[PDB]
Design a protein around this ligand. Structure first.
Ligand code: ZN
Ligand code: ZN
Ligand code: ZN
Lengths: 71, 396, 808, 103, 131
RNA sequence: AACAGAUACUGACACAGUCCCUUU
RNA sequence: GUGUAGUAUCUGUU
């Protein structure tokens, strides 16, 4: 059964899925990817004069409640 | 039309710079981690020059790096967490001049994912267990042990999952031959995703949680969970057991706090501010990295600020109860992403952007001209000045 | 409903399945009340055989799965009907009752079933008590035991009667038995619940508490010694103050507890119990004897004990009191004594036991000979033969041949023992080989055709050791003798002879085989027509070996005859024969050109037998792999034009199998088959599209990493419109093809394809698009990070990732 | 086995135990039943490798003879990083075949 | 309307901020020199013969087969992180041959139908020509 | 549309298997 | 030859 395998993973949707939560998942995954790779974090820390620790803290803070409150 | 990729110069940007005894001798080496290059360095203990011995390439994104040694052992190991869904233990060979893979275990898919561990790599101070965690919901514990043939072994992973949680930092707690314990800076988001008004996003605070590994029952259970005041960014391990007390130092914006489970009133000390600072008063102030120099006589911490000031934290305690935290200004160096203090009196500064420097500690900076600051004293200021407790000997 | 139940009860499989589907789907809407009211008496009808009962429990399982909440007022009756099924001599019946009760528990409130089972706890009948205890055990295995811990704690201390405490401890024991090592986090609670009964005063509760603590210790084999700390003193007192059943239970419990401890505790407690064990070795009852055998083997298999200590105390009384012939009657004592002796040999050494037992190895009794044979065989299998000296190996050889030469009936034990011994000895059996050869030849000579097959198995076993001992002449003589023995009538003996011949041919090469293959293969050819599995297997393996390695000595006409024979043989009812046949086709097509064999295979695609055609397609793919693909590909593509449907399906399946077989060197043939795949993927028939999707999946997985995305994009464009199907097989094929194309091309193109209908107004399209999106998302989401489309934000919600727009 | 929709995988977190295959299932892939290019060893969770179940066949439950493996296609698709592939169900064909034979 | 065709893909693993084609060593051939945000400097060079291309491809395949990445990653999957790799041969993995153990060296070279010194010379010639 | 009958097809689907806790 | 899951196309009665 394929549907049990996909149900457990976090991020998968279904027919009754709204757009806000889909983009919330997109944003959370994007923040985690930014934290993961190194040279992308270097890019972000050079584009604005902030230490990498500050950028990491800001990204972690934005993980809670992105894209505004729900409807 | 086929092309052939070649390299003339490898990356020279340090990301993790753990240290230890890897050659099995009395000399200490530094294992630095570039983006995808694993390199091992040996500073000269007589002329101060830094030399390179191995520059292997791993073809992957290294996300975490820590070292440990088994109790009664002499040679340290290397633990690597990366984008591959595996944990790998390495071991240096001075004779062959190479890294040998001792163990590897698979626990999930590949790539820098949200719910696949590999971000945090806390290890037990004695060497009895290791922990790998994800940013969300995934934590696995492995138990290390030795056999009759003097070889390390690994057990099956133990799961400590938790739904709808985020992890800021994970560190191992020095418990002194008791059940190994791990402390994490968790934070929940279940309710905030269910409040249209949006006040539930506010009033949500971090909780410091302790995970105790039950060796007798072979399972992990969380015991303590206390809400915090500010939002911490990273934790520090306090040497406990026979020397010093247990617990963890929590670093937040404009504060540093000591906490411990069971029965302890926490102690908070504000971070000193630079005198005649030109910055906007709106912004806060945080620490970026730290270090530890535990020794038989005493132990002290080091900490780096955003501006680039090195403090010297000393804990003052009763027979077993801690009383206050004493901060003192040590020196100022370029901002770094990792610092390490070795024996023989050397400081290695791995700058996060630019050249790297090696300093020799000539004075420990005690009872000098500058005053000290304490949590018992009822916004401190200090005057930065050129180097007094450091001498530069090498530049990379 | 009654007609559907009756049709399921007996009838033809097609109408039975149809009635089953109807009484599931429509009778869910009809209602559960009357359904159970009419079904339950059928199962509770006495003198009913097992077929109808199995069918009725199947239909109840289906309706219970489809109807969960509505069965709440019927749980009592369901338990009454199903609960006796828990106690049965059939593993399948026990299992099926287990998931029936588990599904009912998961489809009903726990409090409801607890209250239902309360009135049946206070009973003394051997049936009701045991069945209720096991029902509680499986119910607690489901739903988690913490939900039932307070109830067990309350009921274990019930003062209404002792039997309530007995039932509570029995429930704990059954939970330990069934749930296994999934109880380690909750060990201490159960230990605390049962220790009170352990320290009680009545014999029954004491015995059941000892049994439950033994079950818990067995569940936690490597862990939990700290949790077992309030029961040590009661056990070490009870062993001294008890006689009979209680003593046996306490001994079992302490034996299970011993391995958990550390070294010092192990040795102290093992001697403290060794005193009573040595006292009890001469117990008249057999159950006590097997229990103390288990206890002594557990104590011996512990780090704490010492080899010399065991040798000085345990060995003499054990050998004096247990190595006799009266215990040979029962199988349990047989197993326990054999395994305990093997473990003791592992502890002290192989020689210390072999030297003791080889003397009576050749005892006049037969069961004693079987016992010593099994013991020596296991000891040789584990330890080996390094500990055996010259006299010991001489005595062992004389004993084993003497025992084997007197074979009263069929017995695999002696043959396995002889084979193990001769393999373990290795080169050292060189002086004894001629006697073995003479004995095996004599046993192969005549005598009722019952020992010849055993001799054939023996020579097939010992061919390798005679090879290592440089005795090719004797095995060559045996091979030629078997060659004249190839014509006997009995099938089993013929299969054994063929196996021996195959073993010899493998052992000694075909360049110097004493019976030339030029005389062997024509002799083997008519044997293939024997419609018996045992003969056919060995014959086809021997033929395949000769074809693979000895193809130089056979003429092409003989190969064509045996090819026709293989074409006939592809009709076997067992898969191993068919796999051997297709391998032989491959070897023959390597030996000769791939033209004559291809025509015979391509003409076999109209036999109207589904598995025959599948095997022929696999054989065609094997030929296409062993030879170069472009030799046979034009013939297959030309053959595709036949108007018959089965021929086209066979061609497509052969293409899929070939593309699976060849991974890298398959990019040179994508162009040749692209028009044929485009023709196949057209909306006229389902099976063509299914098989073409399978071909696409295998090809895309094969060519991954070699930059052939241009034609794969076209194939994706042709295969995409098939996802809106309903038949499960076509759905599976299409999803597999899509996953393979996602791996070969990249997640960006698949995301672009699935990004249009992901919010379609129709409900029956969004689910399909979401299944496809989930399949794409689970694999390589970090690429989806960089492949996401830009979204314009709403009035209150920010939907733009501004971090990626930074520019240096 | 992919030929029976009714069968169910355990797919819990895998441990250090190694899976085994009987004589009938030898040489197959525990996911797709393919004989081509075994690639990676199969591991099972400690609940599957306990007591009587130790050293039994992954697919059908018979006595273990040889190790289990993942085919190259499954390794490429990363289907090996999913948990223990041990089958926990008994199937509908097996029980009905047994009952028909014991008619 | 009209679309462009992708003819090459790769994954350096480090963000690139400069691409520029020129000649480095006098008397050599021009190459596509690039520099990355982490401090690395690399080049991409073409093959002078088809035999060289097949040889290097087969060497890369064998080294990927028997010399896996140290940290447990898959080299081909790493190089196809976002888009599948196309018409690029990784030279770092190929040059990892020169520091391998002698037994594996002779095994791989015999699979190459060459002796290890010949493989070393062949690997060094392209680097000493282009750079 | 529902009830019923008939004919074709797919799944390298399978073939005395065997039970490997069945507790006192 | 039989049994375990499915599928397609025809014919009769409402
Ligand atoms: Zn499992
Ligand atoms: Zn099997
Ligand atoms: Zn597979």
């Amino acid at each position: 059964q394929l549907e049990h395998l996909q149900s457990k993973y976090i991020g998968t949707g279904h027919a009754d899925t709204t757009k806000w939560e889909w983009l919330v998942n997109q944003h959370r995954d994007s923040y985690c990817s930014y934290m993961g790779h190194f040279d992308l974090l270097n890019y972000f820390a050079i584009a604005e004069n902030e230490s990498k620790a500050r950028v990491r803290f800001n990204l972690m803070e934005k993980m809670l409640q992105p894209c505004g409150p729900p409807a | 039309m086929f092309l052939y990729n070649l390299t003339l110069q490898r990356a020279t940007g340090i990301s993790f710079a753990i240290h230890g005894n890897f050659s099995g001798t009395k000399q200490q080496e530094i294992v630095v981690s570039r983006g995808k290059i694993l390199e091992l360095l040996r500073p000269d203990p007589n002329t101060g020059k830094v030399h390179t011995l191995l520059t292997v390439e791993v073809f992957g994104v290294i996300r975490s790096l820590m070292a440990f040694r088994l109790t009664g052992g002499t040679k340290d190991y290397i633990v690597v967490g990366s984008d591959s869904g595996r944990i790998v233990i390495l071991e240096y060979q001075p004779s062959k001049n190479m890294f040998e893979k001792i163990h590897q275990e698979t626990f999930g898919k590949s790539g820098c994912r949200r719910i696949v561990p590999g971000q945090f790599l806390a290890v037990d101070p004695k060497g009895r267990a290791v922990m790998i965690s994800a940013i969300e919901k995934q934590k696995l514990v492995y138990i290390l042990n030795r056999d009759a043939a003097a070889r390390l072994t690994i057990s099956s992973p133990l799961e400590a999952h938790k739904a709808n949680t985020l992890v800021y930092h994970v560190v191992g707690v020095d418990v002194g031959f008791e059940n190994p314990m791990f402390a994490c800076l968790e934070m929940d988001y279940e309710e905030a995703d269910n409040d249209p008004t949006g006040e539930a996003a506010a009033n949500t605070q971090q909780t410091l949680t302790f995970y105790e590994l039950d060796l007798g029952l072979n399972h992990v259970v969380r015991k303590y969970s206390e809400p915090l005041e500010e939002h911490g960014n990273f934790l520090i391990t306090v040497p406990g057991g026979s020397d010093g007390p247990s617990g963890v130092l929590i670093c937040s914006e404009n504060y540093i706090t000591y906490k411990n489970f069971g029965d302890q009133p926490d102690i908070r000390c504000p971070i000193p501010r630079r005198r005649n600072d030109l910055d906007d008063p709106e912004r806060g102030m945080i620490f970026v990295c730290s270090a530890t120099h535990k020794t038989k006589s005493m132990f002290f911490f080091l900490a780096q600020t955003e501006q680039g000031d090195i403090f010297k934290i000393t804990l003052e305690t009763d027979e077993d109860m801690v009383t206050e935290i004493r901060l003192k200004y040590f020196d100022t160096v370029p901002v770094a992403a990792a610092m390490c203090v070795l024996k023989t009196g050397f400081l290695f500064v791995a700058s996060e952007f630019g050249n790297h420097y090696l300093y020799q500690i000539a004075h420990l900076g005690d009872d000098d001209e500058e005053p000290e600051f304490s949590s018992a004293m009822p916004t401190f200021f200090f005057q930065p000045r050129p180097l007094k407790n450091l001498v530069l000997v090498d530049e990379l | 409903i009654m007609k559907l139940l009756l049709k399921i009860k007996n009838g033809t499989p097609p109408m039975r399945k149809a009635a089953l589907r109807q009484i599931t789907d429509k009778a869910r809407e009809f209602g559960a009340g009357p359904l159970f009211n009419q079904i339950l008496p059928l199962l509770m009808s006495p003198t009913l055989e097992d077929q109808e009962r199995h069918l009725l429990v199947k239909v109840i399982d289906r309706i219970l799965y489809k109807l969960d909440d509505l069965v709440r007022p019927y749980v009592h009756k369901i338990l009454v009907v199903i609960e006796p099924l828990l106690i049965d001599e059939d593993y399948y019946a026990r299992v099926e009752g287990r998931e029936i009760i588990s599904n009912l528990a998961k489809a009903a409130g726990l409090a409801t079933m607890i209250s239902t089972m309360r009135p049946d706890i206070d009973n003394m009948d051997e049936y009701v008590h045991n069945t209720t205890a096991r029902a509680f055990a499986v119910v607690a295995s489901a739903l988690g035991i913490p939900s039932l811990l307070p109830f067990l704690k309350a009921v274990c201390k019930s003062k209404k009667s002792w039997q309530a405490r007995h039932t509570g401890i029995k429930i704990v024991q059954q939970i330990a038995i069934l749930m296994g090592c999934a109880i380690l986090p909750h060990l201490r609670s159960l230990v605390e619940i049962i220790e009170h009964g352990l320290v009680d005063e009545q014999q029954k509760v004491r015995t059941i508490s000892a049994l439950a603590i033994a079950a818990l210790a067995e569940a936690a084999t490597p862990y939990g010694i700290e949790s077992f700390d309030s029961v040590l003193k009661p056990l070490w007192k009870g062993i001294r103050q008890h006689r009979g059943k209680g003593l046996a239970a306490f001994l079992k419990a302490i034996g299970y507890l011993i391995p958990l401890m550390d070294a010092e505790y192990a040795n102290y407690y093992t001697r403290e119990v060794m005193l009573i064990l040595i006292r009890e070795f001469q117990s008249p009852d057999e159950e006590m004897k097997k229990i103390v055998l288990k206890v002594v083997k557990q104590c011996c298999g512990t780090d704490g004990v010492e080899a010399n200590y065991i040798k000085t105390e345990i060995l003499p009384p054990f050998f004096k009191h247990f190595w006799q012939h009266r215990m040979a009657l029962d199988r349990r004592n047989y197993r326990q004594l054999v395994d305990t002796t093997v473990e003791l040999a592992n502890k002290v050494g192989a020689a210390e036991i072999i030297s003791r037992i080889v003397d009576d190895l050749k005892d006049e009794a037969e069961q004693y000979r079987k016992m010593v044979m099994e013991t020596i065989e296991k000891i040789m299998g584990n330890l080996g033969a390094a500990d055996i000296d010259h006299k010991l190996e001489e005595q062992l050889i004389d004993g084993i041949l003497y025992a084997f030469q007197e074979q009263t009936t069929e017995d695999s034990v002696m043959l396995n023992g002889f084979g193990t011994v001769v393999n373990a000895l290795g080169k050292r059996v060189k002086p004894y080989l001629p006697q073995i050869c003479g004995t095996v030849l004599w046993r192969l000579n005549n005598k009722s055709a019952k020992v010849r097959q055993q001799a054939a198995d023996l020579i097939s076993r010992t061919a390798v050791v005679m090879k290592t001992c440089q005795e090719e002449k004797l095995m060559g003589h045996l091979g030629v003798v078997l060659y004249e023995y190839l014509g006997e009538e009995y099938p089993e003996v013929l299969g054994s002879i063929l196996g021996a011949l195959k073993a010899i041919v493998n052992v000694i090469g075909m360049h110097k085989m004493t019976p030339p293959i030029k005389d062997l293969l024509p002799r083997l050819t008519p044997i293939l027509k024997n419609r018996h599995e045992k003969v056919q297997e060995n014959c086809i393996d021997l033929v395949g070996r000769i074809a693979d390695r000895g193809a130089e000595y056979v003429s092409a006409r003989e190969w064509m005859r045996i090819c026709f024979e293989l074409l006939e043989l592809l009709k076997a009812h067992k898969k191993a024969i068919r796999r051997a046949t297709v391998n032989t086709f491959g070897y023959i097509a390597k030996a000769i050109g791939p033209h004559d064999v291809l025509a015979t295979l391509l003409n076999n695609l109209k036999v109207q037998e589904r598995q025959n055609r599948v095997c022929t397609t696999v054989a065609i793919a094997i030929v296409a792999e062993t030879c170069s693909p472009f030799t046979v590909l034009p013939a297959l593509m030309n053959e595709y034009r036949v108007p018959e449907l089965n021929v086209q399906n066979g061609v497509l399946k052969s293409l899929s199998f070939l593309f699976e077989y060849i991974g890298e060197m398959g990019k040179d043939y994508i162009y040749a088959v692209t028009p044929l795949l485009e023709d196949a993927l057209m909306d006229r028939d389902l099976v063509h599209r299914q098989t073409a999707s399978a071909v696409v999946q295998h090809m895309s997985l094969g060519v991954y990493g070699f930059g052939c995305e241009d034609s794969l994009n076209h194939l994706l464009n042709y295969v995409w419109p098939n996802v809106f199907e309903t038949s499960p097989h076509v759905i599976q094929a299409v999803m597999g093809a899509l996953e393979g194309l996602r791996v070969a091309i990249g997640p960006c193109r698949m995301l672009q394809y699935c990004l249009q209908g992901l919010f379609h107004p129709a409900r029956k399209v969004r689910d399909v698009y979401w299944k496809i999106y989930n399949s794409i998302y689970i694999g390589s989401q970090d690429a989806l990070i960089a492949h996401y489309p830009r979204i314009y934000n709403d009035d209150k919600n920010t939907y733009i990732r501004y971090e990626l727009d930074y520019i240096l | 086995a992919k030929h029976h929709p009714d069968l169910i995988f355990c797919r819990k977190q895998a441990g250090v135990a190694i899976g085994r295959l009987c004589e009938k299932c030898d040489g197959k892939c525990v996911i797709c039943d393919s004989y081509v290019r075994p690639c990676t060893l199969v591991r099972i969770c400690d609940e599957c490798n306990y007591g009587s179940y130790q050293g039994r066949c992954v697919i059908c439950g018979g006595p273990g003879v040889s190790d289990a493996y993942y085919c190259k296609e499954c390794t490429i698709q990363e289907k090996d990083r999913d948990g223990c592939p041990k089958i926990v169900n008994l199937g509908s064909s097996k029980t009905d075949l047994f009952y028909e034979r014991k008619k | 309307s009209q679309k462009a065709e992708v003819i090459m893909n790769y994954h350096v693993g480090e963000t690139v901020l400069s691409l520029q084609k020129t000649t480095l060593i006098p008397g050599g051939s021009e190459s596509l020199v690039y520099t990355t945000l982490s401090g690395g400097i690399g080049i991409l060079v073409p093959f002078t013969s088809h035999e060289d291309h097949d040889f290097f491809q087969h060497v890369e395949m064998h080294l990927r087969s028997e010399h896996p990445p140290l940290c447990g990653r898959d080299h081909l999957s790493f190089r196809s992180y976002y888009f599948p790799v196309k018409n690029v041969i990784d030279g770092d993995l190929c040059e990892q041959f020169n520091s391998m153990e002698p037994n594996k060296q002779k095994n791989v070279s015999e699979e190459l139908d060459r002796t290890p010194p010949e493989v070393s010379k062949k690997l060094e010639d392209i680097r000493t020509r282009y750079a």
